[PDB]
Amino acid sequence: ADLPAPDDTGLQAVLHTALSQGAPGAMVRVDDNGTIHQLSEGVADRATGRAITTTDRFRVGSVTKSFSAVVLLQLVDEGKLDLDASVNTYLPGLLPDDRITVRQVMSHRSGLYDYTNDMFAQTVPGFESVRNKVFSYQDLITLSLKHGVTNAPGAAYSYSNTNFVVAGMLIEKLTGHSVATEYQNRIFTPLNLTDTFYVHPDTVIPGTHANGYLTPDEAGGALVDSTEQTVSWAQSAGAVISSTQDLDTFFSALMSGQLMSAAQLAQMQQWTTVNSTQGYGLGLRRRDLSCGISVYGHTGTVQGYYTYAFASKDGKRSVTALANTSNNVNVLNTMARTLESAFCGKP
Numbered sequence: 001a002d003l004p005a006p007d008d009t010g011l012q013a014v015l016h017t018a019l020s021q022g023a024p025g026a027m028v029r030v031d032d033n034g035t036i037h038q039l040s041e042g043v044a045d046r047a048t049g050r051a052i053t054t055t056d057r058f059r060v061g062s063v064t065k066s067f068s069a070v071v072l073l074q075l076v077d078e079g080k081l082d083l084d085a086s087v088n089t090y091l092p093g094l095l096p097d098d099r100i101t102v103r104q105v106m107s108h109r110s111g112l113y114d115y116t117n118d119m120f121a122q123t124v125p126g127f128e129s130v131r132n133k134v135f136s137y138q139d140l141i142t143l144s145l146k147h148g149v150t151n152a153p154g155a156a157y158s159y160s161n162t163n164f165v166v167a168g169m170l171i172e173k174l175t176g177h178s179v180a181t182e183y184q185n186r187i188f189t190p191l192n193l194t195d196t197f198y199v200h201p202d203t204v205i206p207g208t209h210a211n212g213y214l215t216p217d218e219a220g221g222a223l224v225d226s227t228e229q230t231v232s233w234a235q236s237a238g239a240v241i242s243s244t245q246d247l248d249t250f251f252s253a254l255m256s257g258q259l260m261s262a263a264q265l266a267q268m269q270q271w272t273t274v275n276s277t278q279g280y281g282l283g284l285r286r287r288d289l290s291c292g293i294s295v296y297g298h299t300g301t302v303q304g305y306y307t308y309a310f311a312s313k314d315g316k317r318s319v320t321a322l323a324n325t326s327n328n329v330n331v332l333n334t335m336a337r338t339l340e341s342a343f344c345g346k347p
């Protein structure tokens, strides 16, 4: 049915709170079926003092998985990929088990160890070690394969970045084009997303952007500017750059059925249980809100940025919130509240 009115004061309180908890800046945009809501507080660059705004560009991290999933599902629509075929069928000798399918990799049921557990054990030293490095898809898979699988094929949900590194490799193999070209042609261009880029391995964010600040592991540590990095450790799992308006457009288009066939969208929303209030389909998350409504989209965490991009079942209302800091669980939990205010409204 019709959603309650978004609560702008509640949203203001959420942003203000994230600022009191360590986030230099924070903002949220709500596209409510043609009526826009925009709020922001804090700075985009804590050194120069520039204010953050809802037009600022940022790194979306893991939200990138929805972009990748959309490309793969279109490939299914075209007859080039079968979700239930072995990953080894399309990429011979890649994985140690032929029973792991494309569907399992897309929904995090493959058992592949997540190599970031090795890279970022120590947050700051980990970021300094990989920020300027360029990795191939093979490099990452091989890092994952040094460890055994964590469960039998399809047996259980376990989030792993590796799954979407494999996703990127699949896209390039089946199409013969880089993933950048694929995103541009199938998603960016058609949707006219002018603030959305996949520039890997470039370290600059084009145009006006919010800088990201990595919180150190030690309490009271000085913030580290993490804005410029290759994001080569994530690639098809988390290197997309976008804006609130573009992510709002992308998720509203996805949910209203404009990015693929109805048959594939239903496949994408085939939920594996994550916990009591969350689900994961094919590169898509479901969050159950307190007022009894569910939102669809994805979260993203990459050094210096926390992103929440969700939309209603029909795509009529979409929301993108962003705080420019990471490795701060208080800011992470607080920002999730923009969802309650935006979709559930005034308590």
Ligand SMILES: *C(=O)[C@@H](NC(=O)/C(=N\OC)c1csc(N)n1)[C@@H]1N=C(C(=O)O)C(=C)CS1
Pocket (backbone or CB within 6 Å): 060, 061, 062, 063, 116, 120, 159, 161, 237, 238, 299, 300, 301, 302, 303, 327
């Ligand atoms: C997506 O963004 C990805 N995030 C990471 O790999 C993380 N660090 O990257 C520098 C990360 C995981 S949780 C955290 N505080 N940092 C995946 N996305 C999430 C998410 O928070 O949305 C995960 C829970 C799994 S890893």
